[PDB]
Amino acid sequence: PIISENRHRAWALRELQDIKKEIENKAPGSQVWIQTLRLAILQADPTPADLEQLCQYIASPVDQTAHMTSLTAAIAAAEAANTLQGFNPQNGTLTQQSAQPNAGDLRSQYQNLWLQAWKNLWSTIVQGPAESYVEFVNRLQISLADNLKEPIIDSLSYANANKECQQILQGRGLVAAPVGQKLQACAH
Amino acid sequence: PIISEGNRNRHRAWALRELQDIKKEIENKAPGSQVWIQTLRLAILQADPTPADLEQLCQYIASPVDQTAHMTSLTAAIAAAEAANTLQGFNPQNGTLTQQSAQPNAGDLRSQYQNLWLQAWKNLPTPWSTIVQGPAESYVEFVNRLQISLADNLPDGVPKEPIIDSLSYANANKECQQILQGRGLVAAPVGQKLQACAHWA
Amino acid sequence: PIISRAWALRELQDIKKEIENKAPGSQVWIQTLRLAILQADPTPADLEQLCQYIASPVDQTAHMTSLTAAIAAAEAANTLQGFNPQNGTLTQQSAQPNAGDLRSQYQNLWLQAWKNLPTRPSVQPWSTIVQGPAESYVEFVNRLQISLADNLPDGVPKEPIIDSLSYANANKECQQILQGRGLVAAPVGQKLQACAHWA
Amino acid sequence: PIISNRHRAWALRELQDIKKEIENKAPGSQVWIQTLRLAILQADPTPADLEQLCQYIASPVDQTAHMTSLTAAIAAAEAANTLQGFNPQNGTLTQQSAQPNAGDLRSQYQNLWLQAWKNWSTIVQGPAESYVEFVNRLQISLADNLPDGVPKEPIIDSLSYANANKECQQILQGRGLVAAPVGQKLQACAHWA
Amino acid sequence: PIISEGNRNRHRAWALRELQDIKKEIENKAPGSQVWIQTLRLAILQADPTPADLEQLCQYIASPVDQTAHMTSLTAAIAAAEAANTLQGFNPQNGTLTQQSAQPNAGDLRSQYQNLWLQAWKNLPWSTIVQGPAESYVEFVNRLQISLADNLPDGVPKEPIIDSLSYANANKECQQILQGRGLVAAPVGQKLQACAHW
Amino acid sequence: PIISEGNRHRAWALRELQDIKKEIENKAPGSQVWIQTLRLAILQADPTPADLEQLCQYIASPVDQTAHMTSLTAAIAAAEAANTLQGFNPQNGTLTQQSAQPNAGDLRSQYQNLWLQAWKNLPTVQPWSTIVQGPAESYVEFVNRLQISLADNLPDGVPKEPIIDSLSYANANKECQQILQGRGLVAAPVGQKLQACAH
């Protein structure tokens, strides 16, 4: 944990115990799982070290190790692809760079991947004949928010809809409307 | 949450218990029910939260379905507010509304932001005036259904005061009606209608 | 809450939990409430907030009426100490922080308003409490005092009443003692210590 | 509660906390008394605050019984003028001690408040009861039942010998401890079979 | 408790929470046992309590009987301490030890007091420990140190005693081993290592 | 426990210890969880040798304390002899002594680690070079045992990475080796090695 005043302090156990219980009965990489962790991070603004500590309190060693793996995979890809905003390899690895209290700009990015590492072990996936439009949109925004939105969402919301609701969105010709207006229609 | 310090304010993250408390508080409330909505409004006063903090709440409190549904009506009303120009003091140049209210110093706009957010819960998919007092329903019980239903349902530009006072009589059974006739409280605010009819069997 | 601010939820959480199992307008109920306020020091605004967390909307409604009634009634009677109607209504005046003395009085009527409004029971006939052939004087007084603290007309001073019913509703046995020592008119507490021992 | 010339209101939790520990004790049980004796030290509470306590903690009967016995001893104390530093000119006992600055007097009020929760000896050591167990029951009953102004210690020192079973009375003769403070009596019979 | 706050030495009253916890922790302990005494030692170090605080403790944690036995042996140790003058720095003219040590600035004496207060739990109302033909070595060892930690007399160093009895009191099987390795005089920590096998 | 302000010692809070005990309550002495549980505590408090000695007693039975004190003082001797003690000057007292000072953080830090390790060495775990993939063991588990055995048994100053990277292939069975050969990852960071044999 880093305290902007930016000084690091180690974890309080109370902090950790709370999180475990919250997540206690959730599946690894499951959205609720991901949602639970996401909050804790925001509270603390933690270092990679702190994060590795996390793998250990919450995950089976297998799952930890598996995580260690998918993590570094995601790491190199960002590093290699220069998709890392502000990454200069000259100063050490990201894990080396992100350990810095002031490096909120970089640390933030590291934090994102760490979760993403949990999402591992959208245009393919489509709405079933009787799946509710709203939940269909739910799944859609799930997978998209992962990658990357609006024009895209507003597009796929129709494009990827089933025969029934398509006929409906056509009915008012909201085919090009923002997903928000499309939702209201198929609610019935 | 934004915290008062100097003439500058500082932002603070959630405490999990803070979040848990509200969840516990709201756990058994209906989405968009007044108790649901009022529960939150007070919470807002506590933190004076930025747009981010609020969304975080959706995840903690709402079924994923409800989470999406609210966001929908939300982004919609923003535009409507801009389009109708009901937004006091907004310059799109300084970012969208979502961006500006995140600032510790930008409380008035955040104040406005907080308001719309609440209202978006009445737009959820999850008849108020059809309710009448049964032959065996206590007036207080009758009045209960009535008041819940309005605060739940009645349109916004519409004053509850004149209506409540009116329907409290109109929609009563013969039994309770004759009494109000008896003292001529047909037109009194319902609270005085209440005072009278509380003992009936 | 006014300090030398908005609500704490936990504050709200505790009170519910603490009182939840208490009756509307009941004595234990009123007390559970009376306590929270001092801890917080709330405005007319904060109080309306309270109604909603704890009370059904009907009950919310009824209170507003008897309150405003007592307000006029208290003011008209000039029992209200120091009130100058000129600086705004009572509801208006009480919001400024340095005005602690006046804010204190607003709070009181709010409490009183919970008595005998739509809690009123079919179980109601208070003062019917009598000491059973085998009920202890000490609990008997308890039951009595409970019924009274729940049910009494307002213009009626409680003090003289308590000291009285303690003799009147007592059974055959205990009345004689009070005669025996001549304690029939004594404050009940004195009636208690003397009959505290009887079987 | 008074914290460092300024008064503080109660916290619900404080009150919630206290209720919970005392939950199963009887008024005037020593445990009852010790429980309360502690909070006063923690808070330094006013007459109002105490009166509030009656209400959170006691059935209404006991509340009144107390108010009676209290104000009575108050008078009895002032009448006996055992009341140190009180000027009736500056207000009543009940009124004056409410001042944060009036600590000496507030303290005396509090004791009485304790003493007021006031309103036996048949307990004996069985032929097969351990002396220590016997001794416990004794202090339990004694710490509970006392005439005011009547010292427990000399009373204690007495029954410790008197009410023991056959075996142990004999022991105190042997060492000559019949009148000795009980702490010195325990020392000997701690070993008995 | 005495709280250092901004260079003030200020006494603070107990928190019930503070009292409740200590009880909760100690609840299932035997009176005057090492674990009991150690448990208290921690509390004392956390709070730095006055004689007043300390008596109050007897009452929450101890039966009325055990409290009295304590007050007794305590006031006794006070005298012996004065008599042996193991008591460093006390001037009786400014009040009794009980009296002076209640003062916040008086840290040295209160320490000695607390110490005596602790020791007082020993004396209130042991080498027979042996290993059965079928008893695990470790448990035997455990049993031993327990007893020593509870019943050994003061001024007497435990270590040389421990190192000795760990061999002396073992059964044939394990004795043959300590002889076998010649660990007969070794610190017990070294004796432990070998008999883990039998 | 030491408090940092731009560094004063303070004693334990009982709650602190209880937290630790309750969390650690159901673990075997020296088990990784045990070890992990401890490693964090150190981080939270930065406790002195004295404090730690206090800690043994709260969590450990009297036998385990001695076994600990024994191997501890031993590892101390082994490390000093090896001069793996970074910054240690013997003239100013033992490691147990200097590191009790708030400013002697580097050395105490060195002290704290050993204290942990001694529970590993508890005379009351598989040697990593013995860890091999059985004829029928899943790759993922082999690696796991490996990393455990390593974190448990790796010598200091020795970087794990190349080691991890090396043995991960070497110690695989004939079956999985063909697979690793098949795609050619023998020199790859281990993370890339796991991905393949999942199949």
Side-chain angles (χ1 to χ4, degrees), chain B residues 122 124-125 127-182:
Chain B
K122 287 181 174 299
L124 297 180
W128 54 273
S129 69
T130 63
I131 48 171
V132 179
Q133 181 187 21
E137 177 184 16
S138 79
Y139 188 74
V140 182
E141 192 176 8
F142 162 63
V143 176
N144 220 35
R145 293 171 56 218
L146 194 78
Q147 274 178 327
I148 284 164
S149 195
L150 273 187
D152 197 345
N153 309 338
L154 188 75
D156 336 42
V158 188
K160 291 174 184 185
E161 313 74 79
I163 302 170
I164 277 287
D165 300 344
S166 165
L167 280 172
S168 39
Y169 168 76
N171 287 20
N173 56 20
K174 296 171 173 173
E175 312 272 51
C176 295
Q177 277 185 343
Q178 290 175 320
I179 307 179
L180 302 175
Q181 300 165 355

XYZ file of all heavy atoms in Angstrom, chain B residues 122-182, unseen atoms left out:
467
model
N -35.815 4.331 -11.410
C -37.255 4.206 -11.656
C -37.558 3.733 -13.079
O -38.699 3.401 -13.412
C -37.969 5.533 -11.395
C -38.121 5.924 -9.918
C -38.866 7.264 -9.788
C -39.193 7.653 -8.345
N -40.075 6.698 -7.615
N -36.517 3.685 -13.901
C -36.633 3.268 -15.292
C -36.462 1.770 -15.461
O -36.409 1.261 -16.579
C -35.599 3.996 -16.149
N -36.379 1.058 -14.348
C -36.089 -0.356 -14.421
C -37.338 -1.193 -14.709
O -38.442 -0.847 -14.280
C -35.463 -0.800 -13.104
C -34.122 -0.153 -12.764
C -33.648 -0.699 -11.444
C -33.080 -0.358 -13.839
N -37.155 -2.290 -15.463
C -38.121 -3.341 -15.802
C -38.479 -4.236 -14.619
O -39.493 -4.936 -14.650
C -37.391 -4.149 -16.873
C -35.961 -3.929 -16.582
C -35.869 -2.509 -16.142
N -37.642 -4.216 -13.589
C -37.933 -4.946 -12.363
C -38.724 -4.084 -11.383
O -39.949 -3.979 -11.485
C -36.641 -5.440 -11.684
N -50.299 -1.435 -11.196
C -50.827 -0.079 -11.381
C -51.092 0.590 -10.048
O -51.899 0.122 -9.248
C -52.126 -0.302 -12.159
C -52.459 -1.750 -11.958
C -51.158 -2.458 -11.810
N -50.388 1.688 -9.821
C -50.415 2.370 -8.539
C -51.737 2.946 -8.036
O -51.961 3.001 -6.836
C -49.357 3.475 -8.551
C -49.435 4.429 -9.674
C -48.863 4.291 -10.906
C -50.096 5.697 -9.676
N -49.136 5.392 -11.678
C -49.896 6.268 -10.946
C -50.848 6.399 -8.731
C -50.415 7.507 -11.293
C -51.363 7.628 -9.079
C -51.146 8.168 -10.349
N -52.612 3.377 -8.926
C -53.843 4.013 -8.475
C -55.061 3.081 -8.395
O -56.145 3.517 -8.022
C -54.154 5.222 -9.365
O -54.514 4.833 -10.675
N -54.881 1.801 -8.708
C -55.989 0.830 -8.678
C -56.298 0.318 -7.277
O -57.321 -0.334 -7.045
C -55.696 -0.398 -9.565
O -54.556 -1.095 -9.054
C -55.415 0.028 -10.981
N -55.406 0.636 -6.351
C -55.457 0.136 -4.989
C -56.595 0.779 -4.197
O -56.769 1.997 -4.185
C -54.122 0.397 -4.285
C -53.679 1.830 -4.513
C -53.034 -0.554 -4.803
C -52.516 2.195 -3.698
N -57.394 -0.072 -3.567
C -58.583 0.344 -2.837
C -58.581 -0.400 -1.503
O -57.882 -1.402 -1.362
C -59.854 0.042 -3.649
C -61.092 0.446 -2.917
C -59.798 0.748 -4.985
N -59.343 0.074 -0.524
C -59.369 -0.577 0.776
C -60.352 -1.740 0.785
O -61.538 -1.559 0.529
C -59.754 0.425 1.856
C -59.782 -0.154 3.243
C -60.320 0.828 4.252
O -61.012 1.782 3.894
N -60.011 0.602 5.524
N -59.862 -2.933 1.101
C -60.715 -4.106 1.157
C -61.740 -4.026 2.271
O -61.614 -3.200 3.170
N -62.762 -4.891 2.223
C -63.801 -4.938 3.250
C -63.217 -5.263 4.618
O -63.814 -4.926 5.635
C -64.722 -6.057 2.767
C -63.849 -6.915 1.914
C -62.920 -5.969 1.235
N -62.057 -5.911 4.642
C -61.467 -6.330 5.904
C -60.065 -5.773 6.092
O -59.320 -6.236 6.956
C -61.441 -7.858 5.990
N -59.692 -4.795 5.276
C -58.385 -4.176 5.436
C -58.478 -2.949 6.318
O -59.320 -2.090 6.093
C -57.800 -3.777 4.090
C -56.470 -3.068 4.210
C -55.945 -2.583 2.882
O -56.734 -2.532 1.916
O -54.733 -2.295 2.799
N -57.588 -2.853 7.297
C -57.507 -1.690 8.179
C -57.113 -0.439 7.386
O -56.331 -0.532 6.446
C -56.526 -1.971 9.322
O -55.179 -1.813 8.908
N -57.678 0.714 7.738
C -57.398 1.966 7.030
C -55.900 2.217 6.978
O -55.365 2.573 5.936
C -58.128 3.135 7.688
C -58.071 4.455 6.939
C -58.820 4.649 5.790
C -57.333 5.528 7.421
C -58.801 5.855 5.109
C -57.312 6.747 6.749
C -58.048 6.898 5.592
O -58.043 8.087 4.906
N -55.223 2.014 8.103
C -53.773 2.210 8.195
C -53.050 1.315 7.182
O -52.071 1.720 6.552
C -53.268 1.924 9.628
C -51.778 2.162 9.752
C -54.050 2.750 10.635
N -53.560 0.099 7.025
C -53.005 -0.861 6.084
C -53.295 -0.367 4.673
O -52.435 -0.395 3.795
C -53.650 -2.234 6.312
C -53.024 -3.425 5.635
C -53.707 -4.731 6.029
O -54.756 -4.683 6.706
O -53.213 -5.810 5.640
N -54.515 0.116 4.484
C -54.935 0.715 3.234
C -54.072 1.900 2.874
O -53.559 1.989 1.760
C -56.394 1.122 3.335
C -56.820 2.098 2.305
C -56.798 1.759 0.971
C -57.282 3.344 2.667
C -57.215 2.658 0.015
C -57.696 4.248 1.714
C -57.666 3.908 0.391
N -53.902 2.797 3.836
C -53.067 3.970 3.651
C -51.645 3.551 3.325
O -50.972 4.199 2.526
C -53.080 4.888 4.881
C -52.123 6.046 4.698
C -54.473 5.415 5.110
N -51.186 2.458 3.919
C -49.831 1.995 3.642
C -49.627 1.687 2.157
O -48.748 2.262 1.522
C -49.498 0.773 4.498
C -48.077 0.806 5.023
O -47.547 1.876 5.333
N -47.454 -0.363 5.129
N -50.466 0.811 1.612
C -50.404 0.438 0.205
C -50.399 1.666 -0.658
O -49.641 1.770 -1.621
C -51.600 -0.415 -0.187
C -51.628 -1.759 0.459
C -52.947 -2.431 0.176
N -53.239 -2.540 -1.251
C -54.451 -2.395 -1.772
N -55.471 -2.099 -0.988
N -54.648 -2.545 -3.075
N -51.249 2.606 -0.277
C -51.417 3.836 -1.012
C -50.114 4.617 -1.120
O -49.623 4.876 -2.217
C -52.497 4.672 -0.338
C -53.082 5.855 -1.102
C -54.087 5.344 -2.122
C -53.747 6.829 -0.141
N -49.527 4.927 0.026
C -48.326 5.750 0.081
C -47.087 5.134 -0.555
O -46.289 5.832 -1.182
C -48.037 6.068 1.538
C -48.771 7.286 2.035
C -48.511 7.547 3.496
O -48.318 6.616 4.276
N -48.497 8.816 3.876
N -46.949 3.823 -0.411
C -45.846 3.099 -1.018
C -45.954 3.273 -2.502
O -45.006 3.655 -3.179
C -45.857 1.596 -0.679
C -45.382 1.352 0.750
C -44.956 0.833 -1.617
C -45.721 -0.022 1.254
N -47.154 2.997 -2.984
C -47.449 2.960 -4.401
C -47.166 4.273 -5.145
O -46.670 4.254 -6.269
C -48.903 2.553 -4.573
O -49.137 2.175 -5.899
N -47.492 5.402 -4.528
C -47.259 6.713 -5.129
C -45.779 7.034 -5.256
O -45.286 7.401 -6.323
C -47.914 7.784 -4.273
C -49.372 8.090 -4.568
C -49.798 9.267 -3.765
C -49.555 8.364 -6.038
N -45.088 6.883 -4.130
C -43.667 7.176 -4.002
C -42.880 6.249 -4.897
O -41.788 6.566 -5.362
C -43.228 7.031 -2.557
N -43.466 5.088 -5.124
C -42.948 4.123 -6.059
C -43.165 4.582 -7.476
O -42.273 4.541 -8.307
C -43.636 2.773 -5.842
C -42.894 1.628 -6.484
O -42.013 1.897 -7.325
O -43.198 0.462 -6.160
N -44.390 4.985 -7.737
C -44.879 5.156 -9.085
C -45.206 6.576 -9.588
O -44.777 6.935 -10.683
C -46.046 4.193 -9.250
C -45.673 2.764 -8.825
O -44.494 2.403 -8.799
N -46.670 1.963 -8.466
N -45.976 7.355 -8.826
C -46.468 8.675 -9.269
C -45.436 9.532 -10.010
O -44.295 9.681 -9.564
C -46.954 9.498 -8.071
C -47.663 10.798 -8.471
C -49.057 10.488 -8.985
C -47.713 11.853 -7.404
N -45.860 10.133 -11.134
C -44.989 10.992 -11.938
C -44.472 12.196 -11.184
O -45.030 12.686 -10.202
C -45.877 11.410 -13.107
C -46.886 10.337 -13.208
C -47.142 9.880 -11.812
N -43.324 12.618 -11.673
C -42.464 13.614 -11.068
C -43.025 15.026 -10.944
O -43.085 15.589 -9.849
C -41.195 13.614 -11.898
C -41.010 12.293 -12.623
O -42.011 11.756 -13.150
O -39.879 11.772 -12.635
N -43.470 15.587 -12.052
C -44.010 16.930 -12.041
C -45.277 16.997 -11.214
O -45.877 18.061 -11.060
N -45.686 15.844 -10.689
C -46.939 15.708 -9.970
C -46.815 15.769 -8.461
O -46.139 14.930 -7.867
C -47.612 14.383 -10.315
C -48.977 14.353 -9.725
C -47.704 14.216 -11.826
N -47.476 16.770 -7.841
C -47.505 16.954 -6.388
C -48.331 15.881 -5.704
O -49.479 15.657 -6.076
C -48.168 18.325 -6.223
C -49.050 18.450 -7.414
C -48.315 17.762 -8.536
N -47.756 15.256 -4.687
C -48.391 14.147 -3.989
C -49.408 14.634 -3.009
O -50.380 13.955 -2.709
C -47.348 13.275 -3.323
C -46.563 12.549 -4.381
C -45.373 11.733 -3.933
C -44.676 11.181 -5.181
N -43.555 10.264 -4.900
N -49.117 15.806 -2.476
C -49.872 16.411 -1.403
C -51.367 16.471 -1.736
O -52.169 15.877 -1.020
C -49.341 17.825 -1.129
C -47.819 17.931 -1.027
C -47.134 17.828 -2.392
O -47.126 18.838 -3.130
O -46.634 16.732 -2.735
N -51.747 17.158 -2.836
C -53.184 17.273 -3.087
C -53.829 15.927 -3.345
O -54.977 15.687 -2.976
C -53.251 18.123 -4.362
C -51.904 18.746 -4.505
C -50.975 17.727 -3.959
N -53.060 15.051 -3.977
C -53.543 13.735 -4.373
C -53.785 12.798 -3.213
O -54.847 12.182 -3.099
C -52.558 13.042 -5.307
C -52.318 13.887 -6.544
C -53.084 11.692 -5.709
C -51.203 13.362 -7.355
N -52.771 12.692 -2.366
C -52.841 11.872 -1.178
C -54.086 12.225 -0.394
O -54.892 11.359 -0.060
C -51.605 12.079 -0.300
C -50.434 11.230 -0.789
C -51.896 11.632 1.095
C -50.603 9.751 -0.478
N -54.237 13.516 -0.128
C -55.360 14.024 0.628
C -56.678 13.656 -0.028
O -57.668 13.412 0.650
C -55.261 15.539 0.744
C -54.007 15.982 1.442
O -53.371 15.134 2.096
O -53.645 17.172 1.319
N -56.677 13.570 -1.350
C -57.906 13.310 -2.085
C -58.275 11.841 -2.096
O -59.382 11.459 -1.721
C -57.778 13.816 -3.519
O -58.802 13.275 -4.329
N -57.353 11.026 -2.581
C -57.601 9.607 -2.764
C -57.758 8.849 -1.456
O -58.379 7.786 -1.412
C -56.479 8.995 -3.573
C -56.648 9.244 -5.058
C -55.413 8.782 -5.782
C -57.851 8.483 -5.515
N -57.164 9.392 -0.400
C -57.267 8.802 0.925
C -58.718 8.600 1.278
O -59.075 7.641 1.939
C -56.609 9.688 1.977
O -56.846 11.061 1.727
N -59.557 9.521 0.832
C -60.991 9.364 0.989
C -61.640 8.588 -0.135
O -62.385 7.640 0.094
C -61.685 10.710 1.071
C -63.162 10.523 0.951
C -63.895 10.039 2.012
C -63.823 10.797 -0.231
C -65.239 9.848 1.908
C -65.175 10.607 -0.344
C -65.873 10.132 0.726
O -67.222 9.943 0.625
N -61.399 9.059 -1.350
C -62.064 8.542 -2.528
C -61.998 7.023 -2.598
O -63.004 6.354 -2.829
C -61.458 9.156 -3.754
N -60.804 6.496 -2.358
C -60.511 5.080 -2.531
C -60.769 4.219 -1.290
O -60.328 3.079 -1.210
C -59.056 4.930 -2.972
C -58.832 5.354 -4.415
O -59.624 6.094 -4.992
N -57.724 4.912 -4.988
N -61.443 4.792 -0.304
C -61.810 4.078 0.911
C -63.091 3.252 0.739
O -63.883 3.518 -0.162
C -61.972 5.064 2.050
N -63.297 2.247 1.591
C -64.544 1.482 1.538
C -65.696 2.283 2.154
O -65.465 3.315 2.781
C -64.386 0.106 2.229
C -63.901 0.201 3.684
O -64.005 1.237 4.327
N -63.391 -0.904 4.203
N -66.927 1.806 1.979
C -68.116 2.507 2.471
C -67.999 2.858 3.937
O -68.407 3.937 4.371
C -69.388 1.692 2.226
C -69.699 1.468 0.751
C -70.837 0.475 0.543
C -71.234 0.404 -0.931
N -72.234 -0.667 -1.219
N -67.451 1.910 4.684
C -67.348 1.984 6.133
C -66.568 3.213 6.570
O -67.024 3.983 7.404
C -66.655 0.730 6.660
C -67.204 -0.561 6.089
C -68.359 -1.101 6.886
O -69.310 -0.334 7.143
O -68.315 -2.295 7.250
N -65.383 3.390 6.006
C -64.515 4.470 6.434
C -64.959 5.769 5.809
O -64.666 6.846 6.308
C -63.060 4.179 6.071
S -62.358 2.752 6.930
N -65.641 5.661 4.685
C -66.158 6.840 4.029
C -67.251 7.509 4.842
O -67.196 8.713 5.050
C -66.644 6.477 2.630
C -65.505 6.445 1.623
C -65.963 6.199 0.205
O -67.081 5.740 -0.023
N -65.098 6.506 -0.760
N -68.206 6.730 5.349
C -69.322 7.295 6.124
C -68.874 8.093 7.340
O -69.537 9.043 7.759
C -70.302 6.208 6.583
C -71.125 5.571 5.475
C -71.985 4.427 5.978
O -71.558 3.626 6.805
N -73.211 4.355 5.484
N -67.752 7.684 7.909
C -67.195 8.330 9.083
C -66.675 9.714 8.737
O -66.960 10.692 9.429
C -66.028 7.515 9.672
C -66.439 6.062 9.918
C -65.489 8.177 10.933
C -65.322 5.212 10.470
N -65.892 9.773 7.662
C -65.295 11.013 7.190
C -66.419 11.968 6.855
O -66.311 13.176 7.056
C -64.400 10.749 5.982
C -63.282 9.741 6.305
C -62.442 9.369 5.091
C -62.392 10.226 7.438
N -67.516 11.393 6.375
C -68.729 12.137 6.157
C -69.171 12.645 7.515
O -69.478 13.819 7.680
C -69.815 11.254 5.539
C -69.461 10.638 4.190
C -70.391 9.492 3.795
O -71.257 9.088 4.571
N -70.211 8.965 2.584
N -69.169 11.746 8.488
C -69.646 12.046 9.819
C -69.062 13.285 10.460
O -69.781 14.059 11.073
